[PDB]
C-alpha cells in the first residue's frame, strides 16, 4: 500500500530526518523564520505604529522588528486574502499581516517540532522526556504571544517580534502590570535562574571529578563513547558537596530528573502569571500598604517607591506607545520629581 | 470478601519528605504576603 | 495593620495540610517491617 511506502520514504534515515511530523514542521518553521527575516529588512511599521522597523529604513539588528498590527484590526487573523488586505500583498504588509503570519505559522511549527521529538523518540525507542520538557516553551509562546493579547484589546499589545521591540514589552509590563511583583513571575525566574545554576554547577562538578583514563592533560579524548564505567567519580562528588554545602546528590537518575523539573516548572509558572495578566488580573498592589500610605505621609517602603516609578513609565510612555488613543498630556500634568 | 489483588504499598523516603517540606514551606513564604494582601 | 482576616488561616492550612500529608506517609513508610 502506498501509505506504508509514503511512510517508508519519510522515516528514512537521512542527514536531516524528515518524518511525518516534518510535513507540518518544515513548511511552517521555514515560513516563520522567513517572514521574520523578511520584515526585519523590508517591511515597515509606519502605518501600524508610526515606527521605522526595517533595515531598509535604517534600523540596526537591535532596533529592527516585525511590529504588531494596528489596534483597529482588533484580534483579526489578518489573512492575506481576508477583508483587510483583500488579497493584496503590499497592503497586507503595511497592515501588519506579517505578524499574524509569523505568529500563527511559528505556532504550528512548535506543534510540529514537539511531534517530531515524539515521533523520533518512538522510532529510536527512547522515552519522550524531551517532549514533556518542550511543553514549557510551548506554554510560554502560547500564553504570551496568543493568550495574552487575546485578552487585551487586540494583537497590537502582543510582543512585537524584534530585539528592542521586546524590551518595551518588558518595561511595559513593569510599568502597567507591575509584573516583577507577581508570585508567578518570581517562581518563573527562580526556575530559569535556578535552572541555569544546576546547568553550570553540574557541568563543573563533572569536569573536576573525572577519573584519569588517559595520559594527556586535555582529558577530552580520554572518553569512552561506548559506555562501561562512570566517567566521573559520582562517589567523590557526593562527598565534596556533602562537606561544602551540607547537602549533595547521590542518585544520578534523580539529579537528572531534577534538572528537567526545575526549569520546566519555572516556565510553566511564569505562564500562568501572564494568562492572568491577559484579563489584567495582575498582582499590582498590597492593599494594607496603600491604606497606611494614604493616612500616614511618612510611611515609605521600597514598594511605594516602585509604584511611583510605574506612574512615570505609564505617563511618559503611553503617548507614543498607544498612538490609537490620541493621547495629549500637557507638560503640567506629567508627574516629575524635583529638578529632573 | 476476597482480599482485592490490585493493591500495592505506598512509600515516601526521608529525602522526599524533606524535599516536600522545603517546597511547602517556601511556597508559604512566597504566598502568605499576597494572602494577607 | 489593615490586612486580610483570612490571610492567617489561609497561610496556616496552606502549610499544615500538605505537610501533614507528607508526614503521614513518611511515618507509615518508615514503620514498614523489613
Amino acid at each position: 500500500g502506498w501509505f506504508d511506502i509514503l511512510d517508508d520514504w519519510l522515516k528514512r534515515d537521512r542527514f536531516v530526518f524528515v518524518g511525518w511530523s516534518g510535513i507540518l514542521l518544515f513548511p511552517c518553521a521555514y515560513l516563520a523564520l522567513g517572514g521574520w527575516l523578511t520584515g526585519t529588512t523590508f517591511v515597515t511599521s509606519w502605518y501600524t505604529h508610526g515606527l521605522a522597523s526595517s533595515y531598509l529604513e535604517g534600523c540596526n539588528f537591535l532596533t529592527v522588528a516585525v511590529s504588531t498590527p494596528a489596534n483597529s484590526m482588533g484580534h483579526s487573523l489578518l489573512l492575506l486574502w481576508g477583508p483587510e488586505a483583500q488579497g493584496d500583498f503590499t497592503r497586507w504588509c503595511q497592515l501588519g499581516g506579517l505578524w499574524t503570519f509569523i505568529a500563527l505559522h511559528g505556532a504550528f511549527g512548535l506543534i510540529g517540532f514537539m511531534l517530531r521529538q515524539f515521533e523520533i523518540a518512538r522510532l529510536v525507542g527512547v522515552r519522550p522526556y524531551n517532549a514533556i520538557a518542550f511543553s514549557a516553551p510551548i506554554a510560554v509562546f502560547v500564553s504570551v504571544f496568543l493568550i495574552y493579547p487575546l485578552g487585551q484589546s487586540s494583537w497590537f499589545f502582543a510582543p512585537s517580534f524584534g530585539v528592542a521591540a521586546i524590551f518595551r514589552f518588558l518595561l511595559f509590563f513593569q510599568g502597567f502590570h507591575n509584573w516583577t511583583l507577581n508570585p508567578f513571575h518570581m517562581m518563573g525566574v527562580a526556575g530559569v535562574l535556578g535552572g541555569a545554576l544546576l546547568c553550570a554547577i553540574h557541568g563543573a562538578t563533572v569536569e573536576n571529578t573525572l577519573f584519569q583514563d588517559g595520559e594527556g592533560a586535555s582529558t577530552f579524548r580520554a572518553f569512552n563513547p561506548t559506555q562501561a564505567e562512570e566517567t566521573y567519580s559520582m562517589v567523590t562528588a557526593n562527598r565534596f558537596w556533602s562537606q561544602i554545602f551540607g547537602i549533595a546528590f547521590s542518585n544520578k537518575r534523580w539529579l537528572h530528573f531534577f534538572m528537567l523539573f526545575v526549569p520546566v516548572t519555572g516556565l510553566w509558572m511564569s505562564a500562568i502569571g501572564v494568562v492572568g495578566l491577559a484579563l489584567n488580573l495582575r498582582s499590582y498592589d498590597f492593599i494594607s500598604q496603600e491604606i497606611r500610605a494614604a493616612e500616614d505621609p511618612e510611611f515609605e517602603t521600597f514598594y511605594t517607591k516602585n509604584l511611583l516609578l510605574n506612574e512615570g513609565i505609564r505617563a511618559w510612555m503611553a503617548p507614543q506607545d498607544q498612538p490609537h488613543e490620541n493621547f495629549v498630556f500637557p507638560e503640567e500634568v506629567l508627574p516629575r520629581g524635583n529638578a529632573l | 470478601m476476597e482480599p482485592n489483588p490490585n493493591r500495592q504499598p505506598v512509600e515516601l523516603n526521608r529525602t522526599s519528605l524533606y524535599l516536600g517540606l522545603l517546597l511547602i514551606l517556601v511556597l508559604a513564604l512566597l504566598f502568605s504576603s499576597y494572602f494577607f494582601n | 495593620m489593615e490586612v486580610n482576616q483570612l490571610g492567617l488561616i489561609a497561610t496556616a492550612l496552606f502549610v499544615l495540610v500538605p505537610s501533614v500529608f507528607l508526614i503521614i506517609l513518611y511515618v507509615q513508610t518508615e514503620s514498614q517491617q523489613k
Binding site: 556533602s242 549533595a248 | 529525602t15 524533606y18 522545603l22 513564604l29 502568605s32 494577607f36 | 492567617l8 502549610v15
Partner: peptide, 30 residues
C-alpha cells in the same frame, strides 16, 4: 500577627535545613 507568621515559616525553613544536613539518610555505597 503577620510578622509572627513570616518569622515562623522562616524559623521552620531553618529547622528543616538543620535536619536535612545533619539527619539525612547516610548515603550508602554499592
Amino acid at each position: 500577627m503577620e510578622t509572627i507568621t513570616y518569622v515562623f515559616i522562616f524559623a521552620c525553613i531553618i529547622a528543616l535545613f538543620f535536619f536535612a544536613i545533619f539527619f539525612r539518610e547516610p548515603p550508602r555505597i554499592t
